[PDB]
Design an enzyme around this catalytic site. Structure first.
Site: not given
Ligand SMILES: */C1=C/C(=O)OC/C=C/CCO[C@@H](c2ccccc2)[C@H](NC(=O)[C@@H](NC(=O)c2cc(C)on2)C(C)C)C(=O)N[C@H]1C[C@@H]1CCNC1=O
Length: 181
Positions: A41, A72, A146, A148
């Site tokens: 992503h 992913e 931030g 990821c």
């Molecule tokens: C990591 C990267 C970041 O912050 O960047 C900007 C984010 C952009 C949007 C895309 O990232 C999301 C994604 C990952 C994989 C495939 C598609 C999209 C991702 N989404 C999430 O983490 C969400 N959480 C869930 O859907 C979920 C399901 C279950 C079960 O648990 N959680 C979202 C937090 C609602 C993303 O944002 N990853 C990001 C790191 C996370 C942000 C919050 N905490 C993290 O570890």
């Protein structure tokens, strides 16, 4: 200096890079030669900003499993002089859990950052923003945006790439050595 700190600091020094795509800041892991891996992503384009310069991407491969479900992970091949220190030996042959693991993040906003996630355990299916994802693992630590691309490690063994969370748990895509063969 002790050994678990040395290995993590070595990773930072030669394999873990600060990067920027149109989606934001990420940690990038260089694995060997010109081959690196990013969270899918992060959507790397034709170029990617690495540390201090724009680097062309010659090829990108989003990994899916054998029934075509998202893993992913994107494998990018870089147009660079540098060959990465080959760390494929530190990656298990199959996805491996761990105890007392550490998450290594390296971003412009979160440089050389060390995060004591817990034991890492299996999970499989993850619903990440509508993208169903396999071969993931879990750690009961409230990771945040931030972080990821961050590198999950324990005892000299590179085991996952951080991909998502919920404010109480964090989830990584598991690493296996055949991805980088
Ligand atoms: C990591 C990267 C970041 O912050 O960047 C900007 C984010 C952009 C949007 C895309 O990232 C999301 C994604 C990952 C994989 C495939 C598609 C999209 C991702 N989404 C999430 O983490 C969400 N959480 C869930 O859907 C979920 C399901 C279950 C079960 O648990 N959680 C979202 C937090 C609602 C993303 O944002 N990853 C990001 C790191 C996370 C942000 C919050 N905490 C993290 O570890």
């Amino acid at each position: 200096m002790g050994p678990s700190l040395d290995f993590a600091l070595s990773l930072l020094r030669r394999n873990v890079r600060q990067v920027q795509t149109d989606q934001g800041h990420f940690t990038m892991l260089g694995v060997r030669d010109r081959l690196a891996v990013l969270p899918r992503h992060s959507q790397p384009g034709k170029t990617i900003w690495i540390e201090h310069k724009l680097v062309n991407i010659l090829d990108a491969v989003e990994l899916v499993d054998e029934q075509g479900v998202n893993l992913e992970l994107t494998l990018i091949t870089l147009d660079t002089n540098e060959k990465f220190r080959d760390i494929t030996k530190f990656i298990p042959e199959n996805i491996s859990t761990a105890s007392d693991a550490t998450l290594v993040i390296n971003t412009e906003h979160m440089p050389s950052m060390f995060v004591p996630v817990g034991d890492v355990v299996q999970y499989g299916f993850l619903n990440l923003s509508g993208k169903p994802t396999h071969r993931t693992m879990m750690y009961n630590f409230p990771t945040k945006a931030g972080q990821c691309g961050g590198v999950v490690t324990s005892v000299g063994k590179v085991i996952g790439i951080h991909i998502g969370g919920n404010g109480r748990q964090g989830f990584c895509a598991g690493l296996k050595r055949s991805y980088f063969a």
